[PDB]
């Protein structure tokens, strides 16, 4: 038994709390159920580290069994890592594709053992046939990067993938084209959209979760104003449930032109460079409350409403 892969076994016991510790070990389904009730879960947490390391010794766990526990820990806890999206393109002259899971698991294994000599590859098959892939990057000498993994989410038929941000950016063209060859595609396009919720990023892209339908003394004088500022938000956003996106970086290189000032930047031909980031949770139903508040105009700009439509948040704006 190697010590450095046994350090990762006692690390993931320390990274789970005790309320959901019975959720992970029943879905890990490698230990029998008589040994789970033998280990007392109501004791001190360092005794849970000592009791589970005797169970991993006598059952002879491996580097794929310890990485099987890392997928189930990151399935119920999807909040710690961000998810960038990849867009694969279908080539010309193609009508149907040939996909097989036994043809996918060997072609992705041989494409990573050929390029680098220490790549740990572990697979797990989930509901509606989604493959969950861990890649541990080793460079030329060491046993690979166990503390900082890299996750690829692939739903076995889509050309869209959900890959997490690795801390080694030099292997990111290597990870992208290795998914392209094994899934029978010819072009990989890194699409610029990222968030911390994986369940909301599959709702805004796949668009299957967004729509679920089948006294006269307090009188206002603003009859033409009151239902005008909410009729734009009902025909675009509505009261329907929306996916969550918390970040949008707006790179502006626009100019300044207005009819109020005639001496403020009236001779400038140089562009005014800017970058505008939004850092607030649930932004798609946060901007809909500004229009009945009266602090925003009822002709709302289309840059804030094309965010579930045009399927990115990084925008580049040109204006005179």
């Amino acid at each position: 038994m190697d010590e450095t892969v046994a350090e990762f076994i006692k690390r993931t016991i320390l990274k789970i709390p005790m309320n959901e510790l019975t959720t992970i070990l029943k879905a890990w389904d490698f230990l029998s159920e008589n040994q789970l009730q033998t280990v007392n879960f109501r004791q001190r947490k360092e005794s849970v580290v000592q009791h589970l390391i005797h169970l991993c010794e006598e059952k002879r766990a491996s580097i794929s069994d310890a990485a099987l526990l890392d997928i189930i820990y990151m399935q119920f806890h999807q909040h710690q890592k961000v998810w960038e999206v990849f867009q694969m393109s279908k080539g010309p002259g193609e009508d149907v594709d040939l996909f097989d899971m036994k043809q996918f698991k060997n072609s992705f294994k041989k494409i990573l053992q050929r390029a680098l000599k220490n790549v740990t590859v572990s697979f797990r098959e989930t509901e509606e046939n989604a493959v969950w892939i861990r890649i541990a990057w080793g460079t030329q000498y060491t046993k690979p990067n166990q503390y900082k993994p890299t996750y690829v989410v692939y739903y076995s038929q889509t050309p869209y993938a959900f890959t997490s941000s690795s801390m080694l950016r030099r292997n990111t063209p290597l990870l992208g084209q290795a998914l392209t060859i094994a899934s029978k595609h010819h072009q990989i396009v890194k699409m610029d959209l990222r968030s911390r919720y994986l369940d909301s990023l599959k709702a805004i892209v796949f668009k299957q979760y967004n729509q679920t339908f089948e006294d006269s003394r307090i009188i206002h004088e603003n009859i033409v104003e009151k239902e005008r500022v909410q009729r734009i938000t009902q025909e675009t956003f509505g009261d329907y449930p929306q996916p969550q996106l918390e970040f949008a970086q707006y790179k502006l290189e626009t100019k300044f032109k207005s009819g109020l000032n005639g001496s403020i930047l009236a001779e400038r031909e140089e562009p005014l460079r800017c970058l505008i980031k939004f850092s607030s949770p649930h932004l798609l139903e946060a901007l809909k409350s500004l229009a009945p508040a009266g602090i925003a105009d009822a002709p709302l700009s289309p840059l804030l409403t094309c965010i579930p439509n045009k399927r990115m948040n990084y925008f580049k704006i040109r204006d005179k």
């Binding site: 700009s301 289309p302 840059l303 045009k310 925008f315 580049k316 704006i317 040109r318 204006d319």
Partner: peptide, 4 residues
């Protein structure tokens, strides 16, 4: 307002 075009997006390049």
């Amino acid at each position: 307002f075009i997006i390049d």
